[PDB]
Amino acid sequence: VVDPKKYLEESCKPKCVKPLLEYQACVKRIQGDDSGHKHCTGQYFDYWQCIDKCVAPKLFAKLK
Amino acid sequence: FEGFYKLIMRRNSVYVTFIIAGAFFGERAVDYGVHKLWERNNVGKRYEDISVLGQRP
Amino acid sequence: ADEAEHGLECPNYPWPHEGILSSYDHASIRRGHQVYQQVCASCHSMSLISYRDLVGVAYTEEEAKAMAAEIEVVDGPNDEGEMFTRPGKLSDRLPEPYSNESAARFANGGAYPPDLSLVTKARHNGQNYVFALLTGYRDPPAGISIREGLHYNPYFPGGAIAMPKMLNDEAVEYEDGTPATEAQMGKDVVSFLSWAAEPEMEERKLMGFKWIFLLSLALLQAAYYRRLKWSVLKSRKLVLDVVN
Amino acid sequence: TIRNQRFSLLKQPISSTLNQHLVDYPTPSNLSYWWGFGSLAGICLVIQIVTGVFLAMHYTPHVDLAFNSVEHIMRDVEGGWLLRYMHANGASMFFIVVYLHIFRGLYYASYSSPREFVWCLGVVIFLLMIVTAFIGYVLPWGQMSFWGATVITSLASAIPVVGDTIVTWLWGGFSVDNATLNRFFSLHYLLPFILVGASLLHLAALHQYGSNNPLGVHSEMDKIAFYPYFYVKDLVGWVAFAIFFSIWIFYAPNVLGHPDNYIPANPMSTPPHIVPEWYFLPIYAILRSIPDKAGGVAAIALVFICLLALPFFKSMYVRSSSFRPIYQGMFWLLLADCLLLGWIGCQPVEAPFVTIGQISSLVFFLFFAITPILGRVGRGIPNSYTD
Amino acid sequence: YDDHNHERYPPGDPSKRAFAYFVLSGGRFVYASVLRLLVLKLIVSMSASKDVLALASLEVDLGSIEPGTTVTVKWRGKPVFIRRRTEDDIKLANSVDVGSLRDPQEDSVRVKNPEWLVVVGVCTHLGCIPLPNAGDYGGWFCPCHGSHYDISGRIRKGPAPYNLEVPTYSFLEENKLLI
Amino acid sequence: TIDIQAAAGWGIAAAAGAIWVVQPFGWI
Amino acid sequence: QPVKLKAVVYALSPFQQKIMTGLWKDLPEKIHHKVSENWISATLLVTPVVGTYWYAQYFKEQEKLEHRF
Ligand SMILES: CCCCCCCCCCCCCCCCCC(=O)O[C@@H](COC(=O)CCCCCCCCCCCCCCC)COP(=O)(O)OCC[N+](C)(C)C
Ligand SMILES: CCCCCCCCCCCCCCCCCC(=O)O[C@@H](COC(=O)CCCCCCCCCCCCCCC)COP(=O)(O)OC[C@H](O)CO
Ligand SMILES: CCCCCCCCCCCCCCCCCC(=O)O[C@@H](COC(=O)CCCCCCCCCCCCCCC)COP(=O)(O)OC[C@H](O)CO
Ligand code: HEM
Ligand code: HEM
Ligand code: HEM
Ligand SMILES: COC1=C(OC)C(=O)C(C/C=C(\C)CC/C=C(/C)CC/C=C(\C)CC/C=C(\C)CCC=C(C)C)=C(C)C1=O
Ligand SMILES: COC1=C(OC)C(=O)C(C/C=C(\C)CC/C=C(\C)CC/C=C(\C)CC/C=C(/C)CCC=C(C)C)=C(C)C1=O
Ligand code: FES
């Protein structure tokens, strides 16, 4: 059917609104090139660290 | 404990035999109890609980 | 650079074999082994695992015997002096996808798919790491580009892995009808790999519980023994001439 | 009395030496549990020797077979997993017990006269332990093994003129290879026996004068026989240690280790993080705090020089920290500094850890620099604190 | 008496010796169990490993050899002697007293087809491998301690107690054996 | 007449210890 | 060299005394004694370790933030 991990990842987003907004702000700030050295790896990592922490306790309950 | 003393502690040979018997029987009893706890804590997860065991085509 | 070099940290998942009295989930081990032999084995070796290892863990003896018979193992030399082929037996190790490490690198763009026999013990937070890596393929952060032949995975150190995403939905079919979503196969294959790295785990935990309980009883007895022997000294009354 | 007849078998010539050195040996009645760690270390040594003898029955010291022979010990020989986890975590238990032993000696100034030779033999024993454990860690032939062997054999290159020849003589070639592993195996079987002999000499030197005590005073007025009192006390200690060791063996067998050594040695790629076992980390930190090859090796040697010179410092006549507030505080600071050095050794070599490591190394050497000043000044305490 | 560490029983109370011994025996149980466990773990670590036990059973087929000769074939460290005995050899192996034999056995109960003898070629004395066409009985002579075997692989003189072991062999056709 | 009783007691102890180390229940 | 002592010692048989109850007797006084005499030592051992650890984490966090675009 539908993979529970992606569904949980989408349902856990309201707990990670602050890192998500910060990552979006970083993307907007680097939409200009500056020789292709700017990136948003740290903010990306913060957002996914929050999402993974939210998802992990609940994933294995939906798995067998 | 003085009655048990008059049967088991009067001679060191009987006492040593008692210690050996206690080691044997107590280790067996503890093993049994630990295995009971293990089985009660892991219901459904054993090899013998594989639904399709014997059914690989 | 700074954070991508070490990678994203993996979460903590509640594995069924975690706990001082918790065993492996053996049906999950069997499902994980089918995932392995249907997806992983075409590129990863498991040189430490024999077919006999599965007997009494995930398969009956006849099941593993037929499994081994399905494969072609080299043997010899015969009386004439030539190498030949024979059906696999219970004592054979799992087959190698490639003839040597150089062949593996040549088939995988210069990268060597590591042997997975001890991979959960060969990485920090191994089980969680493997699960997160397998289910953690996604788009790179803005401003990060990946060269051709590599795939972005934030869990992998550096973020660029030579493995393509392989745990795609319904990539396997399960004998018990378990729906084979990406997360389900990830959990099952990690269960199988964790059993492979530590097949003695259940015996080890049973031994540990038993002997720690017994040694605690022994410690109580030892304390009583020591204090019994020392009480004549500790409660003694000492009279001496001196004052200051 | 005239010994015409036979009294206790303990006093017969068959058993008299054992009796007088292990049963009737006079011991200060006020020894605390901090005095059981010598017996604990002896038990750890016997455990290591027994498990290693049985493991050598199944281990193959060849680069093509060593990793596989370990794995075969873990998977194939019955109780092999237990034998390996016992040897690998028994090395850690040995070092924990010996470190506690050493810091007991430091706190109560057990190194002071007349026990200087005891302390020097202990320092020699510590060096032997370090070498033994390191070459043992090379034997599995994982990534950690290969790269640690590389750097430790390279240490000899700090010598300007003959350093390279010593490195290549230690290797048996131009690189760490099968010759290195095979010679490291022989040394690993041998050094434990020399450790046993050194420990016996340590014990004999200690029985020249008897053990020091928590008060640090002359104890001849209140001594009691080792058997049974300190036997049963050490037995309490042995059972507690057994519980501790069993927790490590059965439930956390790999927490005191790095997963890199489960990867077979690859001479092409150094792992991103390359550290020794935890019990070597403080020495690692002192080594890396010097931004110079020869300086680092010289600091490593100066650590043991200071340890050896400690008993010969002109000191005050007061031993125990219980009556020396300043030295007691300095001891606790030294313990914190050593723990910090261990933690720093586990960190990558970058800011802020270079500065922290440098300051910690300085503090560690300041302990040994300041103790003699403390002794010289405190010599004047009885003349300045009058009743 | 000082009472900071221990409080006395009332004076004249019965001694607690029996209770003390009973309590100590409980920990003595554990000490004995621990010692037994550790020793047996070392003894059994020397026993055959799982990889060794996994290679203790198989079958191999064979063919035919000319009469009067012997071929030494393999298995898992136990070589097998196969000899095509001539009619004179069969007659010589059937004219001996059973009572004189150290191990009482008959020729027929050791052979299926009287034209072939298939035995395991390990001396029953101490594991050495007897030499073909040697000894003073026309069979096998063991070079280790001088064990002598006859045409039927039966011990006649020497230290070995038993005759040569007979495996499970059969004939699928005229020139096909199998073990 | 106590040395014989001591020998019998220690023989019982030795037998009990033998059955305990080796535990030959599957062989008897 | 033997010491010359003058003393009188009275002792009670081990089987005439309670063996274990003295472990949990005046426990609060024991805790007070341990804390009151050893708080300086515990401070000297713990404060450098925790302070250095906290400063290192603070430095790492600020350095990571400074390199972020
Ligand atoms: C078939 C017969 C039984 C066979 C087993 C014989 C051995 C049994 C083991 C002993 C069990 C009894 C343990 C003591 C019970 C009393 C508990 C108690 O009150 O604590 C005692 C002290 O006892 C202890 O310290 C506990 C020591 C127990 C030792 C651990 C027993 C080990 C069990 C072995 C079982 C076999 C399994 C293991 C096999 C390998 C208090 O001593 P005092 O302070 O001097 O007196 C206090 C005053 N008042 C009486 C009023 C309270
Ligand atoms: C003071 C008493 C005498 C000395 C004993 C010392 C005890 C004090 C504690 C000392 C420190 C213990 C080791 C510290 C680190 C251990 C924790 C760790 O490293 O993690 C491991 C986990 O650590 C533990 O599991 C702790 C186990 C403790 C044993 C408890 C079982 C008790 C059994 C008998 C009951 C005793 C009751 C006595 C009653 C009288 C690994 O976890 P995992 O997720 O990888 O695996 C999951 C699985 O559960 C572990 O195998
Ligand atoms: C690893 C090396 C570290 C290097 C450190 C850098 C240089 C610093 C070297 C000095 C050591 C730092 C720690 C010294 C202070 C220790 C704490 C202390 O001593 O305070 C005492 C307080 O009294 C003092 O000692 C203060 C004295 C100040 C120093 C005065 C110097 C004159 C004396 C010179 C004598 C020199 C020899 C002294 C030998 C002891 C403790 O009082 P108390 O425990 O008896 O009871 C009070 C408490 O509330 C309950 O426990
Ligand atoms: C479910 C199936 C698979 C699993 C569970 C699996 C598992 C793993 C693991 C644990 C690693 C180690 C990553 C690391 O070093 O941290 C890895 C790496 C790798 N895998 Fe697999 N694997 C699978 C299938 C495949 C397939 C099908 C291929 C090739 C088509 C492949 C090729 C590789 C390569 C090339 C690497 C090394 C990548 C690099 O170092 O950049 N794997 N895999
Ligand atoms: C004569 C006595 C000894 C023998 C025969 C011996 C033998 C061995 C053998 C065969 C190995 C390789 C197998 C393995 O890795 O588990 C090994 C590893 C090791 N030995 Fe020993 N050993 C002895 C004493 C010691 C002592 C006294 C120490 C500590 C000072 C020690 C520390 C080690 C260490 C740390 C390892 C590496 C363990 C690992 O990670 O697997 N050994 N020893
Ligand atoms: C294999 C390692 C060692 C063993 C088996 C051992 C054994 C012992 C034993 C049994 C004692 C007497 C009981 C005790 O005080 O605990 C002792 C005391 C002592 N040891 Fe060691 N030891 C070892 C390592 C060391 C080291 C590394 C040092 C110092 C660098 C050292 C220094 C001392 C001192 C100073 C004493 C006298 C303690 C006192 O009187 O208070 N030992 N040792
Ligand atoms: C990343 O780097 C590092 C490692 O790596 C992971 C390490 O592990 C360690 C750990 C090493 C320490 C603490 C010191 C080791 C010290 C010594 C003295 C070992 C040297 C001895 C060897 C190699 C064998 C001795 C050889 C002999 C006696 C030859 C025999 C000859 C005859 C009998 C004639 C450190 C410091 C390190 O920085
Ligand atoms: C006053 O007296 C006593 C002490 O207080 C100072 C003690 O500290 C101890 C306890 C501690 C001891 C004796 C530690 C000894 C440690 C050593 C030497 C480490 C290794 C031990 C071995 C191998 C023993 C070597 C001895 C011999 C004779 C070799 C043969 C032995 C065997 C085959 C096992 C005891 C028993 C003691 O009574
Ligand atoms: S082995 Fe044949 S006679 Fe000795």
Side-chain angles (χ1 to χ4, degrees):
Chain A
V1 175
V2 284
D3 182 277
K5 183 157 178 283
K6 293 179 179 179
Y7 183 88
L8 269 160
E9 262 149 26
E10 286 263 314
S11 56
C12 266
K13 291 174 65 175
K15 177 175 214 330
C16 303
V17 154
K18 191 148 64 67
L20 172 64
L21 288 190
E22 158 62 23
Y23 175 74
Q24 278 170 27
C26 179
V27 172
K28 253 183 38 63
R29 292 191 309 275
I30 76 166
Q31 274 198 7
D33 58 292
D34 277 43
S35 64
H37 265 96
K38 281 142 172 263
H39 58 83
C40 297
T41 303
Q43 293 99 329
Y44 180 93
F45 273 16
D46 289 352
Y47 168 71
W48 282 108
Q49 169 160 2
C50 175
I51 288 281
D52 281 336
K53 183 178 179 180
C54 180
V55 169
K58 340 167 88 161
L59 180 52
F60 276 32
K62 329 179 85 56
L63 291 179
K64 105 180 81 193
Chain B
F1 284 84
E2 273 290 326
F4 179 91
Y5 168 94
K6 83 162 311 187
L7 269 299
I8 276 72
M9 323 266 179
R10 293 233 76 231
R11 277 305 145 240
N12 203 44
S13 37
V14 179
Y15 186 56
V16 163
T17 306
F18 168 74
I19 286 164
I20 293 167
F24 181 78
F25 286 122
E27 211 205 271
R28 291 321 209 61
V30 169
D31 263 301
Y32 169 87
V34 163
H35 264 277
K36 274 334 226 183
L37 275 159
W38 181 266
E39 295 158 32
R40 156 179 310 281
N41 197 49
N42 297 288
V43 161
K45 289 206 284 183
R46 283 174 326 158
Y47 161 81
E48 309 87 65
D49 321 306
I50 304 169
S51 70
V52 305
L53 196 55
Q55 312 194 13
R56 195 197 146 265
Chain C
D2 190 279
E3 309 175 44
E5 275 198 350
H6 299 100
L8 178 71
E9 293 177 350
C10 49
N12 281 291
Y13 293 95
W15 294 104
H17 43 99
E18 289 175 300
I20 43 82
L21 275 172
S22 288
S23 75
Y24 294 119
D25 176 15
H26 282 273
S28 168
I29 298 183
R30 182 192 185 99
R31 281 194 307 275
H33 175 259
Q34 306 155 224
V35 171
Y36 166 75
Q37 99 192 303
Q38 285 199 26
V39 190
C40 314
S42 64
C43 315
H44 284 272
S45 68
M46 279 196 101
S47 312
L48 293 179
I49 315 301
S50 290
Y51 288 103
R52 46 168 189 99
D53 291 315
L54 298 168
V55 179
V57 167
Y59 294 98
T60 66
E61 190 160 56
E62 80 74 17
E63 263 170 0
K65 273 186 203 211
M67 248 177 83
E70 292 224 83
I71 89 169
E72 299 192 355
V73 171
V74 317
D75 184 1
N78 41 42
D79 285 3
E80 313 50 52
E82 283 95 69
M83 285 342 269
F84 61 97
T85 59
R86 52 142 180 102
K89 311 167 313 223
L90 274 186
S91 55
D92 287 328
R93 300 280 177 94
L94 295 197
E96 313 266 324
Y98 311 104
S99 37
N100 55 72
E101 197 247 17
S102 186
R105 277 169 199 290
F106 181 60
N108 292 270
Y112 172 57
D115 191 272
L116 303 180
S117 287
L118 304 148
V119 73
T120 60
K121 278 207 300 179
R123 306 280 187 268
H124 291 99
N125 200 22
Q127 303 50 14
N128 299 308
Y129 167 66
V130 176
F131 183 80
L133 189 85
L134 291 174
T135 67
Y137 285 86
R138 42 184 170 240
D139 320 276
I144 280 308
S145 60
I146 289 327
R147 74 151 183 82
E148 183 68 23
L150 296 183
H151 319 267
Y152 186 77
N153 198 304
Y155 309 94
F156 192 66
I161 197 170
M163 188 154 48
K165 185 177 168 311
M166 308 300 315
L167 287 191
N168 295 279
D169 266 358
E170 304 80 59
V172 63
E173 233 298 325
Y174 279 139
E175 316 162 1
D176 44 320
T178 284
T181 83
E182 154 189 340
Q184 184 66 57
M185 318 183 270
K187 156 162 174 185
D188 291 320
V189 80
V190 175
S191 284
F192 165 74
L193 292 180
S194 64
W195 165 84
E198 304 140 281
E200 86 304 329
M201 173 294 267
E202 303 194 350
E203 147 186 23
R204 179 163 45 80
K205 282 188 183 173
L206 277 143
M207 251 195 95
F209 198 90
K210 185 239 264 204
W211 286 111
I212 283 164
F213 170 77
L214 291 189
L215 286 176
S216 297
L217 301 172
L219 179 61
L220 191 55
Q221 178 266 6
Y224 174 88
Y225 190 29
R226 191 259 161 176
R227 291 171 65 78
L228 176 74
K229 245 61 190 299
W230 275 77
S231 54
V232 65
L233 289 165
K234 293 235 167 143
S235 71
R236 93 192 151 156
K237 176 174 145 63
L238 170 65
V239 175
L240 301 153
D241 68 356
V242 68
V243 176
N244 65 303
Chain D
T1 77
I2 319 194
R3 282 156 220 285
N4 285 350
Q5 316 196 132
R6 293 197 297 254
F7 285 98
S8 175
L9 203 47
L10 295 174
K11 274 150 110 173
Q12 281 306 122
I14 177 60
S15 59
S16 51
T17 284
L18 263 284
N19 184 241
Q20 153 264 351
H21 286 129
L22 291 74
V23 171
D24 280 346
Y25 186 84
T27 314
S29 68
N30 71 325
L31 288 196
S32 83
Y33 271 111
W34 294 112
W35 264 259
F37 286 98
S39 69
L40 268 191
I43 292 188
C44 283
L45 189 43
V46 168
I47 281 172
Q48 286 308 98
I49 290 167
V50 172
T51 53
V53 160
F54 280 80
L55 284 161
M57 298 188 185
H58 305 268
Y59 167 79
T60 304
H62 201 270
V63 291
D64 292 333
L65 303 163
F67 195 92
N68 280 341
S69 51
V70 177
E71 269 320 293
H72 152 86
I73 288 155
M74 291 289 304
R75 296 179 186 262
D76 293 315
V77 355
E78 138 63 22
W81 70 256
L82 181 59
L83 293 184
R84 208 249 177 163
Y85 285 154
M86 216 154 156
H87 201 77
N89 296 268
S92 283
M93 302 299 110
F94 201 6
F95 271 97
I96 289 164
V97 159
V98 164
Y99 279 139
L100 294 170
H101 197 70
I102 288 163
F103 275 90
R104 189 276 322 253
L106 281 184
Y107 180 93
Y108 294 105
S110 296
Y111 51 81
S112 69
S113 315
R115 287 173 194 86
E116 303 102 309
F117 195 47
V118 195
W119 185 263
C120 301
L121 286 167
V123 167
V124 180
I125 282 159
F126 187 53
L127 288 156
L128 288 168
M129 285 180 66
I130 287 162
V131 176
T132 298
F134 174 83
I135 64 181
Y137 191 68
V138 178
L139 298 181
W141 209 243
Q143 278 281 71
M144 272 313 124
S145 325
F146 179 84
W147 292 110
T150 304
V151 314
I152 262 57
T153 56
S154 285
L155 282 185
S157 77
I159 290 97
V161 291
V162 304
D164 179 38
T165 206
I166 295 176
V167 167
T168 59
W169 171 81
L170 275 151
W171 285 346
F174 301 109
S175 41
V176 177
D177 217 288
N178 190 67
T180 312
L181 178 61
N182 207 338
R183 71 195 43 199
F184 273 20
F185 178 65
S186 184
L187 291 169
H188 195 68
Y189 219 123
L190 169 73
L191 269 40
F193 293 104
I194 292 164
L195 253 170
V196 166
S199 297
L200 292 170
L201 299 169
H202 190 65
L203 197 36
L206 194 271
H207 295 190
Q208 173 168 195
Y209 297 108
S211 92
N212 182 31
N213 67 86
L215 297 177
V217 300
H218 206 55
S219 41
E220 295 288 53
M221 64 292 308
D222 208 359
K223 282 179 159 169
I224 56 170
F226 188 93
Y227 183 91
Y229 307 96
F230 293 103
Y231 158 71
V232 298
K233 212 173 166 168
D234 288 351
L235 168 64
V236 178
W238 306 339
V239 177
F241 161 84
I243 296 166
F244 190 75
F245 196 15
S246 303
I247 289 178
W248 286 116
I249 286 166
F250 296 113
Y251 285 121
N254 288 290
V255 177
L256 312 171
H258 297 90
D260 289 345
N261 228 24
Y262 289 111
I263 307 161
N266 180 200
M268 285 347 290
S269 34
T270 189
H273 191 47
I274 173 49
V275 280
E277 295 302 320
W278 68 263
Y279 37 84
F280 295 147
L281 280 177
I283 294 165
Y284 197 31
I286 294 156
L287 187 279
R288 302 195 305 193
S289 64
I290 325 282
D292 185 18
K293 302 197 38 180
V297 177
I300 271 43
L302 160 72
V303 164
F304 299 91
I305 284 153
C306 292
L307 288 169
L308 270 178
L310 180 56
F312 303 105
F313 290 153
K314 293 179 179 179
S315 78
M316 67 204 286
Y317 306 93
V318 181
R319 287 195 193 98
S320 175
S321 291
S322 319
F323 303 112
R324 296 160 83 207
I326 302 317
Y327 178 86
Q328 175 185 63
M330 212 174 63
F331 160 95
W332 291 115
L333 292 174
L334 169 69
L335 186 51
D337 196 44
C338 286
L339 297 173
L340 277 198
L341 279 163
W343 167 73
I344 285 286
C346 205
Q347 303 298 302
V349 184
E350 76 196 40
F353 303 121
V354 186
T355 306
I356 296 167
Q358 262 146 15
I359 291 157
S360 287
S361 307
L362 173 54
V363 169
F364 179 90
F365 286 122
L366 277 188
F367 179 81
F368 300 87
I370 286 148
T371 303
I373 313 169
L374 265 196
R376 271 147 179 294
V377 174
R379 174 177 176 171
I381 276 182
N383 300 111
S384 61
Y385 298 168
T386 64
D387 177 34
Chain E
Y1 296 114
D2 197 317
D3 58 28
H4 168 63
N5 290 276
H6 299 279
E7 151 191 323
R8 72 173 295 160
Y9 285 104
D13 259 28
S15 169
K16 303 300 261 62
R17 55 148 190 199
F19 169 86
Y21 295 144
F22 179 89
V23 160
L24 300 173
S25 49
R28 265 132 190 192
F29 299 163
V30 175
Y31 299 146
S33 293
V34 159
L35 166 63
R36 179 188 165 265
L37 180 98
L38 288 186
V39 168
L40 276 35
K41 280 298 155 63
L42 298 155
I43 285 298
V44 190
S45 80
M46 290 186 60
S47 93
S49 77
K50 302 143 190 123
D51 44 278
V52 154
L53 296 185
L55 301 180
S57 281
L58 255 188
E59 300 124 350
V60 168
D61 50 68
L62 282 145
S64 62
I65 314 83
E66 44 203 12
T69 55
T70 303
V71 175
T72 84
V73 301
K74 203 206 174 289
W75 182 39
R76 59 128 185 86
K78 281 191 334 205
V80 148
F81 283 156
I82 310 189
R83 150 140 59 179
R84 183 180 212 166
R85 315 142 55 182
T86 56
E87 294 183 346
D88 276 1
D89 280 343
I90 299 145
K91 172 67 69 71
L92 180 69
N94 264 320
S95 56
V96 293
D97 290 329
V98 180
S100 64
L101 281 183
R102 161 162 19 236
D103 185 22
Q105 199 92 305
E106 209 75 58
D107 201 304
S108 202
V109 285
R110 284 169 69 75
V111 61
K112 277 191 178 182
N113 214 359
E115 35 251 54
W116 301 90
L117 176 83
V118 185
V119 300
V120 178
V122 166
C123 198
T124 72
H125 183 224
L126 285 174
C128 278
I129 301 201
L131 273 199
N133 273 304
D136 40 19
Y137 293 103
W140 280 274
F141 169 76
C142 181
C144 283
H145 314 94
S147 279
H148 292 79
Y149 305 89
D150 53 56
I151 295 282
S152 210
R154 283 166 308 172
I155 184 81
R156 297 276 189 88
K157 93 187 283 280
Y162 307 122
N163 317 305
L164 298 187
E165 179 137 37
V166 172
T168 63
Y169 65 94
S170 66
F171 325 94
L172 323 157
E173 64 194 40
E174 284 85 29
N175 41 11
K176 250 303 192 66
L177 272 276
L178 168 70
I179 294 174
Chain F
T1 59
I2 308 175
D3 290 344
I4 296 161
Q5 322 193 314
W10 282 125
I12 295 207
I19 304 168
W20 168 65
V21 189
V22 175
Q23 283 187 5
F25 306 126
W27 174 85
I28 296 175
Chain G
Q1 147 74 31
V3 47
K4 283 222 306 178
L5 56 92
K6 177 248 284 207
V8 176
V9 194
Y10 309 86
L12 187 58
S13 178
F15 301 117
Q16 286 297 331
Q17 326 178 29
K18 292 178 196 226
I19 302 310
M20 308 288 289
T21 54
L23 280 148
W24 58 79
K25 183 178 179 180
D26 324 288
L27 255 178
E29 157 146 17
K30 295 262 190 23
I31 286 102
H32 163 271
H33 262 212
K34 281 194 162 63
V35 170
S36 64
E37 320 193 83
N38 303 323
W39 72 267
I40 297 181
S41 294
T43 293
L44 294 176
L45 165 74
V46 173
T47 309
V49 178
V50 171
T52 309
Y53 185 84
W54 202 95
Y55 165 80
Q57 323 315 288
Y58 172 84
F59 183 105
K60 289 168 56 62
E61 187 86 298
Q62 306 304 346
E63 207 29 48
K64 193 190 45 124
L65 278 35
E66 292 229 358
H67 275 272
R68 258 177 201 190
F69 307 97

